[PDB]
Amino acid sequence: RIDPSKLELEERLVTVNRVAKVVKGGRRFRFAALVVVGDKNGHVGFGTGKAQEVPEAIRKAVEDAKKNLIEVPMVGTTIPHEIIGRFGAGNILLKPASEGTGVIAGGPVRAVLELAGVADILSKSLGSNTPINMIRATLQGLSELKRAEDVAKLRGKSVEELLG
Amino acid sequence: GQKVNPVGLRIGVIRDWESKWYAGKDYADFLHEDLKIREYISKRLSDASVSKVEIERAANRVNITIHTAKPGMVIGKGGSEVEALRKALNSLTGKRVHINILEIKRADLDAQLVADNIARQLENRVSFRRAQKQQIQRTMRAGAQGVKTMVSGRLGGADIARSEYYSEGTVPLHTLRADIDYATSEADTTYGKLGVKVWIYRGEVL
Amino acid sequence: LLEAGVHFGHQTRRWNPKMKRYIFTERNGIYIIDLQKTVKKVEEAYNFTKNLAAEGGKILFVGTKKQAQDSVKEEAQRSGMYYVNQRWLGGTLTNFETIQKRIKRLKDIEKMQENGTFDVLPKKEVVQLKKELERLEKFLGGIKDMKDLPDALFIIDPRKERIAVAEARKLNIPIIGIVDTNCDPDEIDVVIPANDDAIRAVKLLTSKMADAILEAKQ
RNA sequence: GGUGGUGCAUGGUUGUCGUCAGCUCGUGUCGUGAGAUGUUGGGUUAAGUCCCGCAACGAGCGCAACCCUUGAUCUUAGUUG
RNA sequence: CGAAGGCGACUCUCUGGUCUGUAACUGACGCUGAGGAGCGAAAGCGUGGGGAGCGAACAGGAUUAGAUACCCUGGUAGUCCACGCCGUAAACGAUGAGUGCUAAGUGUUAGGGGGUUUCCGCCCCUUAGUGCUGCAGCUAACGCAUUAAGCACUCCGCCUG
RNA sequence: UUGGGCGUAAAGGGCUCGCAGGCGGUUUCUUAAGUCUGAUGUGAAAGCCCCCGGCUCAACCGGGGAGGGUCAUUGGAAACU
RNA sequence: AGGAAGAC
């Protein structure tokens, strides 16, 4: 489900990288910039872009992240349950916390989760330290989650007899 | 090992000369004297940013026309520059001079002014990349058909000297009826010496 | 008319089975046409294209089946919907800025060929421009006068125009297509299983849908 | 004032591969990514020159043309021929 | 075909397994397996044979700067049989054994059952191998994919720059 | 174990027969060894933590609770091993 | 299936 552009987004960049290519006259040099873009109301996307100029890569990455967005569950400013984001040899274990701990996360993961607007999540990185793989792992993890009321309507029960 | 200078390649066939006269058997000392006029005009009018001067002989009178594209900070009260230039030029060359000024409408398509603009931001010590992008934006918002810009030298890095290019639109250097305006400017900064080459495809000639 | 009885439906038994699992032993040896599920899938397609007429932008068709291209082109020109008759260029929905600036150049050249200065050199402008018009008007098709993003799409064959449904997948366009039995009907519940190459059957169904939206437009 | 050192502190010029035919970008697809596509394939050309399929559609510097000279003729212009 | 190494002329004696069908039996007798025992290509060793061809070693002829090598001419041990030994290979599917679920297409080997036949073949189920493409799914990619490197359970072996 | 892997990165024994060992198809009664749950006695006092008081909160000093048990006796439950 | 040819 594509989301429209009628939102205010904070487009805080996470990482640029010096990227090479070898040709007969030596090396050509580009910059691959990946950013994370999303409002505090529970929508997050990431973006990647290659350019010969760093702000050009920035605008390309923010256009790609505006193209690709996904919405996260934000009930009680903290995720409903424990999850493991698993993609590509990065394993981000996400666990909900009580309401005063603050977000405890590694760098790219804390950028994504703080840009989501979660308040209290304990996460651990059990995989590799590659930033794009952490980003794809944590977005797959945040996509995997589901509402308590969604579980209620798919099981045909009500939220009070799910909780007790 | 580079391209031949486009104004020097276009003169004589498509481009009219900036000097329209003949001298016989005194050709040498007229070239020496009128280059003394051109260096003096450049030295005292670099603030007023002349694009080009062009001269002619009137049988032991000389006519000078100067293209500056603004009267504003140039003419003063209107007669100040013509008295302070005509008497001084009379004192230098010893011959009868006449001076006239001309203006360029849509004034951001003249290459010598563009290269002087780049050079002026380089002694203003704003960043060269910002200078390139701002001048590209200025030339397209004035309107044009192609711009190619080059700045070479030590661009802030001490141990390496490398050039940077920025272009937009079509600038064919090999079509003859193309009317490229070309300009080379020289900038002296605390880092060293920087060369600017800007060349602009303004229009077409049938 | 909705009678069926025209098409056998497919080529020989090297086919992709999608209904194989719970079919009992039958003395016919092949499937018989399910007329009730056929008429209700045609009814829900009828209601969906009634909604498509309710916003008003009807449909754009794509195809490359050369036994049916001129026929679906003349049906498109008769009944007002849009068409891809020749080879469908890649990335129409994603490069629509390039497509709209190209179609803007078609408006400029199609006005300068008749209103502007016609004779400045006798043959070179003719052999460049008229051939260039012929190339773009044969390779672009009837997608000229949209001035907007498309709303819905029908495909002659998902296997033959395989990347079109990928672009519609990416940019979230509701999809309509007749499928053969080697195709993938598993994606969308709105499906038209019929013979993709029988010209009489495809003319019957496209004529029924064209007359359906013709009576839906008012 | 240095025709004194530093071309590996530099602009400004030049040769070279090489008149070789190639070198890239915008938008978009494919890929976790570096990247790829366009720019490959077929037929011809001296050429990425032209055209037909093709997740590509286009654009830019190049190639070719426009420039000069030598190759026949009409009009005008005949001296210092 | 064999558990692996491996096994291709034909005949005989002895002998080990494997597969299909049945439902006549016993009624959980099953899986895995540290140490242990047994096999185990080629080369090698001991004793006695045999030695056609090939042929390490070794010698002559070239080529090269040298050429203890490739190339040519010979040629001992070996390769073959019987009795023992050593116990290694890129001993390879570089994939431990067992059991069960998970889309299809197409060959081949050995069967069983049905539709006008005890005629030729034609189709559909059906195992047990043996291939080749190819989903979901897995992988870091290559790739694997009912002969899993998928989803599980048991037991063993092994790794920690 | 919670919390890794073994085609190509380090990592499948050359393969088999099997002792001890490690696991075990369905049903029905039976015991309570494993399992779960009460009661009692114990796991000293200082220590960590929970709640109050004092030296100008304080560092510390006190007063009352929670356990660090595959702990011993005994009662109860029979789904699973 | 159509020559031996070293080093930086």
From Swiss-Prot, chain A:
Keywords on record: Antibiotic resistance, Ribonucleoprotein, Ribosomal protein, RNA-binding, rRNA-binding
InterPro entries: Ribosomal_Su5_D2-typ_SF, Ribosomal_uS5, Ribosomal_uS5_bac-type, Ribosomal_uS5_C, Ribosomal_uS5_N, Ribosomal_uS5_N_CS, Ribsml_uS5_D2-typ_fold_subgr
Substitution effect: G26V: In rpsE1; spectinomycin restistant, not a ram mutant
PROSITE patterns in the cross-refs: RIBOSOMAL_S5 (PS00585), S5_DSRBD (PS50881)
Consequence when changing G102R: In rpsE9; suppresses S12 mutation K55D. Lethal in the absence of the S12 mutation
Outcome of substituting K24I: In BSPC 111; spectinomycin resistant
MF terms in GO: rRNA binding; structural constituent of ribosome
Pfam families per UniProt: Ribosomal_S5, Ribosomal_S5_C
GO CC, alphabetical: cytosolic small ribosomal subunit
Superkingdom: Bacteria
SUPFAM superfamilies per record: dsRNA-binding domain-like, Ribosomal protein S5 domain 2-like
One GO BP annotation of this record: translation
Residues in S5 DRBM domain copies: 9-72
Family: Belongs to the universal ribosomal protein uS5 family.
Further remarks about this protein from its record: Altered S5 proteins have been identified in a number of mutants. Some mutations in S5 have been shown to increase translational error frequencies.
Domain comment (free text): The N-terminal domain interacts with the head of the 30S subunit; the C-terminal domain interacts with the body and contacts protein S4. The interaction surface between S4 and S5 is involved in control of translational fidelity.
Oligomeric form and interacting partners: Part of the 30S ribosomal subunit. Contacts proteins S4 and S8.
Physiological role: With S4 and S12 plays an important role in translational accuracy; many suppressors of streptomycin-dependent mutants of protein S12 are found in this protein, some but not all of which decrease translational accuracy (ram, ribosomal ambiguity mutations).
Protein name according to UniProt: Small ribosomal subunit protein uS5
Organism of derivation: Bacillus subtilis (strain 168)
UniProtKB/Swiss-Prot annotation, chain B:
Annotated ranges, domain KH type-2: 37-105
Highest taxon listed in the record's lineage: Bacteria
Molecular function, one GO term: structural constituent of ribosome
Entry's transmembrane regions: none
InterPro entries hit by this protein: KH_dom (IPR004087), KH_dom-like_a/b (IPR015946), KH_dom_type_2 (IPR004044), KH_sf_prok-type (IPR009019), Ribosomal_S3_C_sf (IPR036419), Ribosomal_uS3_bac-typ (IPR005704), Ribosomal_uS3_C (IPR001351), Ribosomal_uS3_CS (IPR018280)
Keywords: Ribonucleoprotein, Ribosomal protein, RNA-binding, rRNA-binding
CDD domains registered for this protein in UniProt: KH-II_30S_S3
Pfam families recorded: KH_2, Ribosomal_S3_C
GO biological process, one term: translation
A GO CC annotation given for this chain: cytosolic small ribosomal subunit
Oligomeric form and interacting partners: Part of the 30S ribosomal subunit. Forms a tight complex with proteins S10 and S14.
Family classification: Belongs to the universal ribosomal protein uS3 family.
Function noted in UniProt: Binds the lower part of the 30S subunit head. Binds mRNA in the 70S ribosome, positioning it for translation.
Protein name according to UniProt: Small ribosomal subunit protein uS3
UniProtKB/Swiss-Prot annotation, chain C:
Family: Belongs to the universal ribosomal protein uS2 family.
Stated name of the protein: Small ribosomal subunit protein uS2
InterPro entries on file: Ribosomal_uS2, Ribosomal_uS2_bac/mit/plastid, Ribosomal_uS2_CS, Ribosomal_uS2_flav_dom_sf
Example of a GO biological process term: translation
Highest rank taxon of the organism: Bacteria
Keyword tags: Ribonucleoprotein, Ribosomal protein
UniProt GO cellular component terms: cytosolic small ribosomal subunit
HAMAP family assigned: Ribosomal_uS2_B (MF_00291_B)
